[PDB]
Design a protein around this ligand. Structure first.
Ligand code: CA
Ligand code: CA
Ligand code: ZN
Length: 548
């Protein structure tokens, strides 16, 4: 009757203070013959003894009709708060992998945040913690692709550094800027989760929280991607996709692709954020970030949309073809307004408020404007009270629609069947972030539970019983679409893979499988590839639960 059902738990585990779910999922070909009134019993059991420490009848069945299709039962063993290691065991039924009760999101946060260090480009790594190593890569980054006012095609720019974007080695302003902004916000809201020396970095012990050293790596690369008029180049990559080789073997010439106004505004926003946040630690870096943001805005105020993405620029890198810059300009306006207080920036906001504010949506490289909504409401001084009230209402409504989807979803993931896209994991966690934004304005325990459920979900509470974060839990991605991992045979831990995707591009998954549309194989770049913008909301949501 309980074959082959599965009991799903967070494969890392649970903090003592939080709700603690376990989900019994029945075989797709099964009940059907649910004997009416049948009730599964769950025990939690010490890993060492097998001593039962918690026992409870499971609620259910429920049919996850809008998402997985599964028949679920569930328990909440919140009561159990004794630190240690455990297994969940359905009587006469399946057993879970081992998990801890303890401050588990400190280690999750660590791995996710430190993964950026392991993605850095343009610098040798020989890391003893991890075993990850490669010699100096991409020290020739890079040559200007098209003529512009400053440089002829073929000019060498010093645009070394930054992060490898994903499982390739391209560096892209569009993800780098939203990623840096989101790490910054994690730190700003949860500074007590982030210390100097936390991340075992080259910068550990300089008196600055390591997460800010990492952010600074990304932002300093943005500086090199900025043209003296303030415009920001779109991305830097080879003409060809490297094979599964090390980054130091990827010796093709690399090119700096043409500017874009969305990139210019995203970098403005992230820099203006850093100006505010780095002020107590490094006042000179603060100023510099502020000067850059200001020069970028000068460019934007003199320029219409520039959003050209020639198909041929995609020959060795992804497009990130964000085809509207208004949500990016809004965000840049807010952040500049917040740190300078200047009318010129608030004027832009008020003008937009007359014709229509950017749509409120989970933070993404297309639309980052939720950060502007939030930062205006929480950080803006002497604003317009009618705008502020509009921003607040949109923030609470956004969480509300997220929460409604979460309630429709047996596994917690706020995404319905038919809507699983490339990066669905990131989208889950980013929706977790909108719940937490609303929670921050208006505390609401169910929202915090729903956000936690996004961590549980990416860490094994899902119909594949899969941990989508490398090196975490008991069933992580062993074959990530990641060139260094594949070439080196050394795992890079702490990277979140995209996850389930209804719309396949490769051979190893079929369409419309929803939360089941995933394959742990190297080739599946649409399902099993990590990216910097995936890790960003992971670090955010994890930091919430690492600090309380
Ligand atoms: Ca430091
Ligand atoms: Ca945009
Ligand atoms: Zn590199």
């Amino acid at each position: 009757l309980l074959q082959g059902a599965q009991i799903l738990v967070n494969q890392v585990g649970y903090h003592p203070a939080t709700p603690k779910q376990a989900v019994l999922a029945l075989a797709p070909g099964t009940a059907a013959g649910i004997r009416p009134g049948w009730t599964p019993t769950l025990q939690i059991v010490r890993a060492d003894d097998g001593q039962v420490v918690w026992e409870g009848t499971m609620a259910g069945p429920s049919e996850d009709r809008l998402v997985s299709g599964d028949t679920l039962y569930r328990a909440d063993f919140t009561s159990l708060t004794a630190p240690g290691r455990y297994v969940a065991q359905v009587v006469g039924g399946p057993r879970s992998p081992e998990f801890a009760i303890g401050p588990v999101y400190r280690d999750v946060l660590y791995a996710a945040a430190r993964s950026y260090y392991l993605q850095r480009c343009g610098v040798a790594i020989d890391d003893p913690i991890t075993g990850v190593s490669h010699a100096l890569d991409h020290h020739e980054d890079g040559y200007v692709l098209v003529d512009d006012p400053f440089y002829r095609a073929g000019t060498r720019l010093e645009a070394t550094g930054g992060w490898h974007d994903a499982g390739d080695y391209g560096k892209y302003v569009t993800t780098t800027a939203v990623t840096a902004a989101q790490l910054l916000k994690a730190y700003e809201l949860y500074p007590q989760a982030f210390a100097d020396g936390q991340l075992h970095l080259p910068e550990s012990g300089n008196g600055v929280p390591d997460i800010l050293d990492e952010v600074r790596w990304g932002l300093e690369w943005l500086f090199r991607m900025q043209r003296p008029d303030g415009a920001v180049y779109h991305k830097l990559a080879g003409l060809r996709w490297p094979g599964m080789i090390r980054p130091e073997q990827d010796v093709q010439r690399r090119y700096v692709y043409r500017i874009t106004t969305q990139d210019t505004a995203k970098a403005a926003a992230a820099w203006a954020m850093a100006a505010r946040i780095f002020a107590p630690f490094d006042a000179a870096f603060a100023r510099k970030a502020l000067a850059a943001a200001e020069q970028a805005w000068r460019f934007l105020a003199a320029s219409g949309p520039i959003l050209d993405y020639p198909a041929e620029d995609n020959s060795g890198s992804g497009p990130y073809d964000d085809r509207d810059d208004a949500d990016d300009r809004f965000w840049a306006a807010v952040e500049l307004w917040v740190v300078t207080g200047r009318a010129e920036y608030h004027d832009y906001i008020a003008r937009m408020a007359r014709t229509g504010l950017p749509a409120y949506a989970p933070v993404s490289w297309v639309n980052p404007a939720a950060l502007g909504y939030f930062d205006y409401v929480t950080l803006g001084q002497k604003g317009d009270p009618a705008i502020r009230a509009r921003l607040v209402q949109r923030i609470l409504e956004g969480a509300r629609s997220v929460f409604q989807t979460y309630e429709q979803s047996g596994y917690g993931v706020p995404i319905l069947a038919g809507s699983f896209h490339w990066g669905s994991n990131k989208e889950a966690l980013a929706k977790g972030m909108l719940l937490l934004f609303a929670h921050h304005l208006e505390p609401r325990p169910e929202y915090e539970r729903a956000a936690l459920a996004q961590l549980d979900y990416v860490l094994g509470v899902n119909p594949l019983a899969k941990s989508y974060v490398t090196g975490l839990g008991s069933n992580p991605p062993r074959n990530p679409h990641h060139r260094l991992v594949k070439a080196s045979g050394v795992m890079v831990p702490g990277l979140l893979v995209g996850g389930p995707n209804d719309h396949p591009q490769t051979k190893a998954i079929r369409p419309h499988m929803g939360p089941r549309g995933y394959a742990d194989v190297t080739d599946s770049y649409e399902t099993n590839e990590p990216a910097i913008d995936y890790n960003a909301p992971l670090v955010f949501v994890a930091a919430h639960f690492a600090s309380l």
